[PDB]
Amino acid sequence: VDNDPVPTSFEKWAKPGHFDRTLARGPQTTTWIWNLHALAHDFDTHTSDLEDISRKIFSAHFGHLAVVFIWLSGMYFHGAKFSNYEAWLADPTGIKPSAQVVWPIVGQGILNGDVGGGFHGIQITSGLFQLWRASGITNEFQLYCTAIGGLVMAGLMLFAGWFHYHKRAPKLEWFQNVESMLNHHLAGLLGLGSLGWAGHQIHVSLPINQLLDAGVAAKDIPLPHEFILNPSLMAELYPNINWGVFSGVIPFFTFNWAAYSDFLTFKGGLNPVTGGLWLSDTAHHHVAIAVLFIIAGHMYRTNWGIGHSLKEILEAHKGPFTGTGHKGLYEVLTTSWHAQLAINLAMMGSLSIIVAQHMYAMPPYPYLATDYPTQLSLFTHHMWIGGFLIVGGAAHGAIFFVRDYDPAVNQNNVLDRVLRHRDAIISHLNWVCIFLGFHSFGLYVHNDTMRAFGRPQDMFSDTGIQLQPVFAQWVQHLHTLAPGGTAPNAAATASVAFGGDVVAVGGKVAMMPIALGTADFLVHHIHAFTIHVTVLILLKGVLFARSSRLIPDKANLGFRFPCDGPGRGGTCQVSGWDHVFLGLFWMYNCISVVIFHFSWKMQSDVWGTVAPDGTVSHITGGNFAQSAITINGWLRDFLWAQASQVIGSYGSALSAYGLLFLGAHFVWAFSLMFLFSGRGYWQELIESIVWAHNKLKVAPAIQPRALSIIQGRAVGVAHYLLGGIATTWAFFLARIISVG
Amino acid sequence: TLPDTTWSPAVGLVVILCNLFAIAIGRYAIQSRGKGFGLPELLATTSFGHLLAAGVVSGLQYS
Amino acid sequence: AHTVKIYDTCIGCTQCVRACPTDVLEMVPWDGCKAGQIASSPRTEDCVGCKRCETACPTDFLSIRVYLGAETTRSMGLAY
Amino acid sequence: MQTKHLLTYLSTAPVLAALWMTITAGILIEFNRFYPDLLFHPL
Amino acid sequence: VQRGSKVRILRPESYWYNEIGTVASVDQSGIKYPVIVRFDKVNYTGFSGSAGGVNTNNFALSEVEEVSA
Amino acid sequence: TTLTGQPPLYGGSTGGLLSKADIEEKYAITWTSPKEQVFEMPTAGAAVMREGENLVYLARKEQCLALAAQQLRPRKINDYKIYRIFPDGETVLLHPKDGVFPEKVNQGREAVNTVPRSIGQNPNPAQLKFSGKKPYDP
Amino acid sequence: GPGDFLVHHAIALGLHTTTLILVKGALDARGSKLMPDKKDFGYAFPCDGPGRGGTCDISAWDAFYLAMFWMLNT
Amino acid sequence: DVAGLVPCKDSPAFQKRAAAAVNTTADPASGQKRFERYSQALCGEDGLPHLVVDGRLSRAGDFLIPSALFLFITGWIGWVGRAYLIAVRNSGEANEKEIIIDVPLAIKCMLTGFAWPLAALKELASGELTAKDNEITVSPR
Ligand code: CLA
Ligand code: CLA
Ligand code: CLA
Ligand SMILES: CCCCCCCCCCCCCCCC(=O)OC[C@H](COP(=O)(O)OC[C@@H](O)CO)OC(=O)CCCCCCCCCCCCCCC
Ligand SMILES: CC1=C(/C=C/C(C)=C/C=C/C(C)=C/C=C/C=C(C)/C=C/C=C(C)/C=C/C2=C(C)CCCC2(C)C)C(C)(C)CCC1
C-alpha cells in the first residue's frame, strides 16, 4: 500500500484523452471522439504496468458498486414512497405490484392505470414487492431507511474508490494474493452474507412471514426488533427450543439440532398458501450454504502453512493426453486480468441462466408464481443477462489470447495443445452445428410441409411419427419418486414441475407439472443447436485470435481490427472482435428461442386459472403440443395470436408497451443500415455534405469522418440487440399483464 | 425421522476422539510445519476434528 | 495475379516494403526523390492483395497501387 | 487553479449539450404545465 | 515558390485540391515534386478507426500556385 | 537446395501442411539461433528453437514471413532464408534473394512495375477501350 | 385524407432517398475524395482495403446494392 | 370550408368524442377546454380537426404562424452556430474550441441571433456568405 500515488485534481478532467497517447493531440477528425469512448475503460492500453492497471480496476469496481447501491436505494425509495406495497401486502392476489407513478403532463397519466387499492401507477414486474415480503419487510419506513442505507453505502464505495486510487493504493502482490482473496471470498464474502441473511431469516423473515401466512393482516405484527427482544413471540412459533440468549444457542453448541428442526426444515415443494417457497427451507438453506462456504474458504495457504497453493494443485493435475496438463495456468491466471474476466463473465452468465431457470420452477418468493408478469419478466431478464455475459466471457478470452498469451509460459499444457488442434475442434463443432440444424429445423419445416400437404400422420408429432423425450421424462420421474424415496428426510419434491399436483394460490395456478412431449423434444434440440452455433462462432474467435491458415499474424493486427484487406479472396471479419460481433446475433437467436419456448409452454401447459371444482384452464389452452411443431404454428398461435395485446394497447395503461413495440421494431430496422452497408459510401456522402457546408463558410474545423468499419459493425449489432430485445420485452409485458 | 441428537457424554467422547484423530492426521498429512506443531497447526487440527465430529455425531445419533 | 504499380510520387519511405506480408516489394536505386530509393514490385506472383502497402503509403494520393486481377492459389492465400 | 479546470470540464461538448438539452426540455415541459393541447395558433 | 508562401494545390487527385497550404521547404535538387506543402486538414490516410491523418505532401512547381508571397 | 537444419521441438499440429505441400508446392525457412529459445509457430502453439540451424516447413510464403517477422526478428535472428520447394524436390531461395533484405536499397536491383507519372495522370478507360491497354500501363 | 397525405410524403421520401443513393453512386463512380482513381478499378470491386479510414462499400456497384434495399422499401 | 371540410362546431362526431375527453394535463378540466379550443378548427367526417396549409390568412394559425416561429428560432440557431464556427476559425485552437466550447464567445454569438435575418441579408448583399468555387475542395471527375 502506497501513500498519495495520484494527485486528486481537476486538471485532467479538462483534458479529454489524457489516458492515451493518440487521444491527446487534439481531435483532428471526428473519429477521435468515438475513439475516446472506445478507449476509456481499456486500462491495459492506458499504461503498460500491471500495478497501475490493477489499481485502476480496483477503484473502478468501487465506482460500479456505488452505482449499483444508488440503483438499490432508488428501488427502495420508490417502493417506500411511490408504490402500493402495504396495500399489496394486505391483499396479495387481488393487488398487482406497482410503483413509478408517472407525472401527468402530456398524456402519460393514462399509464397510471388502476392496479388496485386506489393506487394509480405503472405495474412493476421486477418482483420487488415479493422480495420485501419474503425478507420480512411489512411497512414502508423500513424500505425508506434501506434507501438511506443504500445511499450511504454508495457514498462509502465512492469514497473507497477515491481512497484506494488517489490516497492509499495497493501494490501488485496485494492483488496477486489469490490465496487470501479466494479464502476471503468463499468464506468472508459469501459465507458471512449467507449466515447473516440466515440471521435475518431465523429472527426476522420466518417470524414475520409465518405470521403473515395465517391472515394476521400485516400491521398487527410486532416490529422485527421485538422478535429477539421477546422470545415470547418465539414461544408459539415452533416452541421446541428454550429460546434464550444463552440457552437457545446451547443446542447448536451441543450437537442438538432436532430441536432446531422446527424452523430449520427440509420440506421442499411450495407453500400452498402463498405459492412461494417454504421460508423455513430457505433459512435452513442459507445456514447450510453459509457453513459450506466458510469451510470452503479454509483451503488456500495464506500465512500459516495450512491450505493449498492453487499452483501445486494445478501443475500437479496433468495426464497422459494433456502433456504437462495445467503447467503454466497459474502464471496465466495471476498475470492476465482478461483471462480472469473471461471465466468470471462466462460463469456469471451461466449463473444468471441458472437463476432464470430456477426462480420460475421453484418459485422462491411469496405471490410471485401467481404473478405471471413477474415470473415471465424475471426468467427472460436473467436469460438475456446470462447470454450477454457469456458472449463477453468469450470476448475477453479472445482479448487474452491476442494480448496476454505467452508461448514460453504455455508449453505442452492444455492451452498449447488446444491451440495445436483448434482445426479438429472447429471442424467437429461445425459438423455438430450442421447436424443439429438439420435434425431440428428440418424437422420443423418437414412438419410445415406435411401439414400443408394434408399429411398429419407423416409429421414429427405426438399423433404422427413420435419423438418422445424419454430421458427428460425419466429424470422428471426420478424427481417425483424422491420426496419419499432417494430424498427420504424431505416432505415435498424440489419442484412441482417434475410432478405432483396443481399448486393453486388464489384462482391461479402457481406451479403444475410440465409434461414433455414431441414439441419439447424439438424445441430443446433447437436450443442445443443455437447454443452449439454460438459456441462455434465464439470458440473459433478465441482459438483463431492469434493466427490461422489465412492470416498467420492476427496477433500483430490485434483483437479489434476490421480485416486484412480485400486480398486472399477477402478477409473481412477475421478478428476476434468480429467473432464476438457474430456471436452476439447468435446469442440473440438462442435466447429469443429460449424465452419464446418459456412463454408459450408456461401459457399453454402451466399457467391459467383453477376452477372452484379444480379444473385448470390454461391461458392458450394447450395449443403447444400441436402448434409448436411447425413454424406456421409458432407464427400463428404464438407470435400472431399473443401480439394482439401489444397492438390493441392504444388508449389504455398498456399504451407505452405498444409504443415501445413499434419503437423497437424501428431501432431493429435502423440497425440493418449499419449492418448491411460499409463506411466508404458514408465517407463519400459526407464529402458532398462537407462541400455544402464549405460553400456557406460553415464546415467544422473537426473534420466529419464516417464511423470506422468496426464501429459500423458495433452500432449495427447494438441497435439490432436493443431493438429485438425491446420488441420481445414490450410484447411479453403487454401480453402477460393483460392475460395474467 | 428427526433423530435423537441430544446432549450426551458420548457426543463429547466422539468429539474428543475425532479431535485426537485429526491431530494424528495432521501429524501424518500436513506438509508445512515451520509455521506457527505450532498454534496454526493445532487450531487447524482442532477445527478439522470439530467438522469430522459434527459429521460423526449426526451420523451416529441419526442411525 | 495481382498487379502492384508504383508511381513517381514515391518518397522512398520504405514503409510499403516493410508492410508486405508476402515479400513482394523491394527498394531499388532511383534519383527521383530525396531518399534516393523507389519501391519496386518484382514479385507480384506472390501478391495476395492485402493492400497493407497502400495503408502504409504517406503520399496523397498513394504512390503504390494494387489492382486485383486474376486469382491463383498464391493470391487467394490458400494453405491447401 | 482547480475551479478553472472545472470551468473547462463544465464547458465541454457533452456537458454543455446535456445542460442546454435539459434547459430546453424544461422550457417545453413547463410550457405544457401551462397552456396545453396546442395543435395550432388559436387566432 | 518559397517557405511560408501560401499555395493553392492544383493536383486533381490530391485531398487538398483548390485548397491552400503553407510551403515548409522547396527542394533545391532537381526532383519531380520538390515542394513540401503542409496543411491544417489532415488526410484520410491511416487504418480504420485511426484518429489521425497526414497534413503534408509533395507537389511539383506546376501543381502549386502562390496565393500570397 | 538440400536444406539443412534441425527441426524445432514442435509437438505437431493440425494447422501445418496439407496435400498442396506434396502435390503443388511448400515452403521452408532456415535460421541460426545462438541458443535454445521459445517461439510461436504460425500454425499455433509453442515450439522450442534449437541452438544452431533450425529448418521449418510451412504451407505458404506468408506463414514463413510471419514467423520471420513476429518471432525471429524480435529475437535478433536476422539470418533466416525462405525457400520454395517443389514436389519433385527443387528448391528456390525466396526472401533474402540478393542477400540484403528488401527494405534496404541494394544496387543491383532493377525497377519493376514503375509508372513514370502520378496516379491522377493515368488514362481514362473510355479512351482505353478495345485493346490490351490498362490505365496503369507504363 | 390525412392518411393519404402522410403516405404520399413517405413515398416522396422513398423516391428521393433511392434517387440520392443511386445518384451519389453514379456521380462518384469516377472517383471521390476518398478514392480519386475509381475509374481504373471498374464498376464492381469490393473495396480499397481498410486503409484511408476504411473503404467498405465504396464501389458504384455497392451504391446499386444499397439502393436496391431502398427501392424495395419504397 | 376548404376541400369539403366542415368546422368543428358544426360536426356531430366532434361533440360525440368531446363528451368523453381524456385529461391530458393535471388540470381537472383539461380536455374540456381542449375540445372547446379545437372547435374553431376545420373538422372532417371523422370529427378530427384536419389542418389546412394554404396561406389562407383566416386559417393562418394552423401552419403559417408556427412556420414563422420555427423559421425564426431555427435561423437564430443556425446563425449563432455559423458565427461561432467562423469566430473560432480565426484562432488556431479551433479543434480544441469545438469540443471545449468557449462559453463567453458562445453567449456573445447567442445573444445576436435575434437579428439573424437582416445581418444574413447583408452577407447576401456583400459576398461574405458564399465562398468561391475555386476555394473549396472538390473530387476529380
Ligand atoms: C474527488 C473527486 C475526484 C477528482 C478531482 C478526481 C480526479 C482524477 N481522477 Mg479520479 N476517482 C474518484 C474521484 C476523483 N477523481 C472517485 C470517487 C473514484 C472511484 C470511482 C475515482 C477513480 C479513478 C480512476 C481509476 C482513475 C481516476 C483518474 C483521475 C484523474 C483523471 C481525470 C479524468 O479524466 O477522469 C474523469 C472522469 C469522469 C469525470 C467521468 C466519471 C464517470 C463516473 C464515475 C461514472 C458515470 C456513469 C454514470 C453511472 C452515468 C451513466 C451514463 C448513462 C446513464 C447515460 C484525475 C486527476 C484516472 C487517472 O489517474 O488517469 C490515468 C484513473 O486512472 N479516478
Ligand atoms: C464484467 C464485465 C465487463 C468488463 C469489466 C469489460 C471490460 C472491457 N471490455 Mg467488454 N464485454 C462485456 C463485459 C465486460 N467488459 C460483455 C458482457 C460483452 C458482450 C457485449 C463485452 C464485449 C466487448 C467487446 C466486443 C469489447 C470489449 C472491450 C472491453 C475493454 C474496454 C471497454 C471500453 O472501452 O468501454 C466502452 C463502453 C462503451 C463504448 C459503451 C457502448 C454502449 C453499449 C455497448 C450499449 C449500452 C446500451 C444500454 C445498455 C441501453 C441503451 C441506452 C441508450 C438508449 C441510451 C474493457 C477492458 C473492448 C476491447 O477492446 O477490449 C480490450 C472491445 O472491443 N468488451
Ligand atoms: C453550426 C451548426 C450547423 C449549421 C449552420 C448547419 C447547416 C446546414 N447543414 Mg448541418 N450538421 C451539423 C451542424 C450544422 N449544420 C451537425 C452537428 C451535424 C451532424 C449531425 C450536421 C449534419 C448535416 C447533414 C447530413 C446535412 C447537413 C446539411 C446542412 C445544410 C442544410 C440545412 C439543414 O440540413 O438543416 C439540418 C441540420 C441538422 C439536422 C444537423 C443537426 C443540427 C445541429 C445539431 C445544429 C448544430 C448546433 C451547434 C452544435 C450549436 C452551436 C452553437 C454554439 C453557440 C455552441 C445547412 C447549411 C444538409 C446539406 O448538405 O445541405 C445541402 C445535409 O445533408 N448537416
Ligand atoms: C441491448 C443493448 C445492446 C448491446 C450492445 C453491445 C455492443 C457490443 C459491442 C461492444 C461494445 C463495448 C466495447 C467498446 C469497444 C468497441 O468495440 O468499439 C468499437 C468502436 C470503435 O473502435 P475501433 O475499432 O474504431 O477502435 C480503433 C481505436 O482503438 C484506435 O485504433 O467504438 C464504438 O463503436 C463507439 C462507441 C462509443 C459511442 C459514443 C459513446 C456515447 C455514449 C455511450 C454510453 C451509452 C450508455 C452506456 C450504458 C449506460
Ligand atoms: C439489504 C441492503 C442493505 C442493508 C444491509 C444491511 C442493513 C444489512 C446487514 C447486515 C448485518 C448486520 C450483517 C451481519 C452479520 C454477521 C455475521 C455474519 C456473524 C458472525 C459471526 C461469528 C464470527 C460467530 C462466531 C462464533 C463462533 C462460530 C465460535 C464462537 C461463538 C461465536 C458465536 C462467537 C443496504 C442498506 C446496504 C442497501 C440496500 C440493500
Ligand SMILES: CC1=C(C/C=C(\C)CCC[C@H](C)CCC[C@H](C)CCCC(C)C)C(=O)c2ccccc2C1=O
Ligand atoms: C449511417 C451510417 C454511417 C453514418 C453514421 C454516422 C455519421 C454517425 C453519426 C451520426 C450522429 C447524428 C452524429 C451526431 C454528431 C453531433 C454529436 C450532433 C450534435 C447533437 C447535439 C444536438 C447534442 C456510417 O458512418 C457507417 C459506417 C460503417 C458502416 C455503416 C455505416 C452507416 O450505416
Ligand code: SF4
Ligand atoms: S469490404 Fe471492408 S472489411 Fe472487407 S476486406 Fe474490404 S475494407 Fe476490409
